[PDB]
UniProtKB/Swiss-Prot annotation, chains C, D:
Species: Bacillus phage SP01
Assembly mode: Homotetramer.
Residues involved in Mg(2+) binding: S38
Protein name: Thoeris anti-defense 2
Role description: Counteracts the host Thoeris antiviral defense system. Probably acts by binding and sequestering cyclic ADP-D-ribose signal molecules produced upon viral infection (3'cADPR or 2'cADPR); sequestration prevents the signal from activating the ThsA of the Thoeris antiviral defense system.
Length: 77, 77, 85, 85
């Protein structure tokens, strides 16, 4: 699978998890929690993209310029 | 107050809120939720920096290169 | 217009921006890895098969200055993107 | 060494890196607004009082290439920073 970031973004908006081929650390993906999600979660939030890093920790995802322009996005399956 | 980002970071690590002078939108600050904070919040998380944007919404903060090197950081008081 | 659409416009060499941005006269422009090899190559850019610089996205940050653009989560998920006339 | 310490080292013209980084031979280096005005100024950089480029932080991303560095939240809050020998 060779998706762009924009295509990988609509996949995130529909509740699925995406990852990149040329990423260094493994078992790594992104997931998007909506405001209502984050609200029922904790009580106003905006949409927040997270990342399950290699250490099984959840951090706020920071898009690198490479990740934004990359074409190697795939869906977790 | 003219703090660097590193000094503004230790202020975030002690549970205080920081902001920049040369920021465009107003009523804007950062705050840091720890893992244990985010855990008692919702159940493993890492440290996550947030930002109360101008629209009173909480987003995951993305550091611009300007914000990182800036010297106009101040504490909310 | 979403960010994914603004990306394809950026990769085609045009300037994009967000209406929801605070600043005025701000826009993103992309300098591809091959474009930088030509601008810094002195007519030898076509022969460089592995340029040093990767792709760099720039932003003219209202102050008539140019910085390297850091894509915020708000910009990535935004739908207020538009092309500079 | 924290990120704030790595910043002052970066502003002084030395290369920093994180041991917790996956990639090898990766390091950040800072190109100040005045440094870029000299390198692209042809001996006229000293007379430029308002350079076009702001400060740009770069990263040599293991592939022997250079990109504009996007500071992740992990790097910002990290304490595994170190100076390149």
């Amino acid at each position: 699978t060779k998706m762009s970031f924009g295509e990988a973004l609509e996949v995130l908006k529909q509740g699925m998890q995406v990852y990149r081929s040329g990423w260094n650390g493994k078992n790594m993906f992104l997931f998007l929690k909506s405001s209502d999600a984050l609200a029922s979660d904790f009580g106003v939030f905006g949409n927040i993209i997270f990342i399950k890093t290699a250490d099984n920790k959840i951090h706020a995802w920071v898009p690198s310029q490479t990740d934004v322009l990359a074409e190697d996005w795939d869906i977790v399956s």
